[PDB]
Subunit: 255 residues, 4 copies
């Protein structure tokens, strides 16, 4: 499928990023992983698919470090064919009490990192006349929730940026799109559930409690589901999908 | 991959519906075809994929014929697992000059027939614990164009219907979603190209595309069938009530 | 404000239509009322504002009757300067059990009547090079709810039709826009509340119960609020508002 | 009508912000002006309406200066009842050539300063049981254009922020909404017209409008001030978290 391609997935040492990375690896792509932690387990999870991988620990709020991450991709793989901008971080507080440092960090990681990844990957994509930029946004790139000022702003910004990049690259074989997930089973969400079960509560009940307000299906989107969508967007059938923001959300945005 | 599944694609005797049907057959689904013209060519295109196909000639203007369509699917194949509501027509005129019969016919086929297909297919999908309803809407379900009063109304209606059905089925293994294409080179678009050329036909074709579709490239029926196939996969399981555009950048600006 | 103008408001013998009619009358517009009932009270409610009014009982699911309604407006007032398409009707059922006659009626009144009103009013608006068409749609022209297949389809159709008409009239002084209300205090909603109070329950509690699911403000939009918005759209400041769908919804669509 | 109310309009020394400030003053609000250039002309435009005005020169890039802006409003007038987050800048370049300092400056002013204004104004609005926060976003908060990476991102951010704040304040008499203009003839747009003309300047002006805005007519600052005035009325009381476009048809297609 993607034999001969290289994908860079940000925040891919765990959760959504890792799930997407795994699907792409199985499809035959070499992977540039990024994220916190010993990367030996993550690299091994990719390499066991019979593909090459490297990792860079870049903190994507630091532009110098994002530059280092792309310089590594250029050195080891000759540049990125497929960039997955996957991100960071959340903080909940009413707008008037929303911490200034948390606003700045959420903007830096969830929004500005996407611009920097994009400006760094796009020249090589154009030069090779083939490329895919996939921005993992959120239902919160299309609607708001209480307590999430910075995250909703940042994710809406990503949806907007995606449109501009989709338009700028429209006459080329490079596309840029966004996927907007609802509730996803991440290690953090799984921890919330496990913490309920450790107290003695029922894990499925904990899930239904978490999802009831916003997600009609009461069922999680999985990293595997998102990886499969990324894989679709990288296919020939994705060639005229441009500047789109496709929601995978168990009905969140339908109401 | 769709082996063991039955797909019904309305208006599959040409253009997009035929493209979608081909991809689903290639995936292993048995197919119920529908639409006007000689069905033999469409039947041969599907069955080359080593799958069974039948054509039913229902005029989807007529609710009784839609019912006969679904009853045949039930007797032939034991019911519809994947329903693609594709059949559609176009008429271009300013709203105050828009023929009343065209408004009624476009609403009846491009909107009401989607509701009729959906209502007929959903009970068996529920009862068998799995289903996919995919509505072929348009960029015109999300935005307007001049001269397209009935079509844009109907297509917006389809996008709204899709949300209701997606919500209603959210606690089941049935999903309902819309695909919103930009320009695809079919007889429907050719007529618009010709009416513009009435003049170099290829210049008319380019101008028609360039006005709306930044990629300056048409979407293909095969691309759209591959998306239907994706929405039929397990990865589509929590895509519900969505309207996903494949449009060369039409809606991004 | 609108001295010298004529407004036709469909479904204006009560509720939202009447509220809009009243605001326009106070602004100085003559009114063409339409709807069920003895119209003497409704006409008198308009005429006491020092404006002229007429009424036609047209059932807007019957195209011949819609024609009669506009023929009356042409005869008595020389045509409509301001058309408010305000509508009909609701029915709740799962899609697979949604009655065929109810689908057809809801489409006819909530959607097709808008096309017919529009085709009948627009020639005279262009001829006079001034006009306003305002379609009272719904939050359900932008999102779905369970049990409302026909109404959501019809209201989405109205939002689409509004865009086409806004574009077709863009180079002229005629505009066409939609207002998309959330929960509105109508006589029917007031009846639901009164029925609760007659049993002994608290009226404000009944309101909070009705609104809690969908409308964060827990407060109604009123016909007066909607009339004031119509009035704004008819002002010079509305001259470049074209094909818009403006929501007044206590936060419904923000989430 | 706004008699007894205090409005703060960021970036009100020219263009849209000055237009909005004028209409609010005419309505009877006392005004806190802000923005670069000689403030005397703007002060004279507002005070001709028989209202008090002060100008504070805060560079909204700088959060400490935003705080001093709001503290002055508090000492001068007892706080801000109507906040219009208007100040904004533009820079056009392809994304991969987009200056890093321009990305940061556009995000800081066109998005983060809206959050800072909002956070500073909301407590007093809540405490006094009434308020209006109106964000001047753009059609570019809803769609993209080529070369406008930072601006479109920021404006989409503003439209999202607006929804959160509208929800959060929904059980109060404070509303927060966005107005999304299409093209308005200001210095910001003039620069784009000039860069296109670099060539008849009036042809450049028309072409710039016609590409995006079907009405072939600019929106005026006065029109936008009249909308702010409407959103400040009782009829605006349940308009919450909305993004209302005034755009000559830009978003309808
Ligand atoms: N072609 C495009 O650019 C484009 C873009 C977006 C959406 N669409 C939509 O795609 C769908 C298919 O359109 P297309 O371009 O392939 O057009 P097409 O004319 O090539 O095919 C239409 C099909 O529908 C059938 N049909 C027409 N009326 C019917 C009726 N009453 N009952 C049963 N079948 C009927 C025709 O026989 C044919 O099989 C339509 O819903 C159209 O609105 C088309
Ligand atoms: N003009 C348009 O077509 C258009 C369309 C949609 C939205 N907008 C938005 O309208 C708003 C006003 O733009 P405009 O067209 O009137 O532009 P303008 O350049 O004429 O006015 C901008 C104002 O903001 C001020 N300003 C700039 N930087 C500032 C800073 N750091 N701190 C404080 N004030 C600052 C300027 O001094 C001026 O008062 C912007 O947010 C813009 O994005 C403009």
């Amino acid at each position: 499928t993607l034999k001969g391609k290289t994908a860079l997935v940000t925040g891919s040492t765990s959760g959504i990023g890792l799930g997407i990375a795994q699907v792409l690896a199985r499809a035959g792509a070499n992977i540039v992983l990024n994220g916190f932690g010993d990367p030996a387990p993550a690299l091994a999870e990719i390499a066991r698919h019979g593909v090459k991988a490297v990792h860079h620990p870049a903190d994507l709020s630091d532009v110098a470090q994002i530059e280092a991450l792309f310089a590594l991709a250029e050195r080891e793989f000759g540049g990125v064919d497929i960039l997955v901008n996957n991100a960071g971080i959340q903080h909940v507080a009413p707008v008037e009490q929303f911490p200034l440092e948390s606003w700045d960090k959420i903007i830096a990681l969830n929004l500005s990192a996407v611009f920097h990844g994009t400006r760094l990957a796009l020249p090589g994509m154009r030069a090779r006349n083939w490329g895919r930029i996939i921005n993992i946004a959120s239902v919160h790139g299309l609607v708001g929730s209480t307590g999430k000022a910075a995250y909703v702003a940042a994710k809406h910004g990503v949806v907007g940026l995606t449109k501009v990049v989709g338009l700028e690259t429209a006459t080329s074989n490079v596309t840029c799109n966004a996927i907007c997930p609802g509730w996803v089973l991440t290690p953090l969400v799984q921890k919330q559930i496990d913490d309920r079960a450790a107290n003695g509560g029922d894990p499925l009940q904990a899930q239904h409690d978490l999802l009831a307000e916003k997600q009609p299906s009461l069922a999680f989107v999985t990293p595997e589901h998102l990886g499969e969508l990324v894989l679709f967007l990288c296919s020939e059938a994705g060639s005229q999908v441009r500047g789109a923001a496709w929601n995978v959300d168990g009905g969140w945005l339908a109401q």
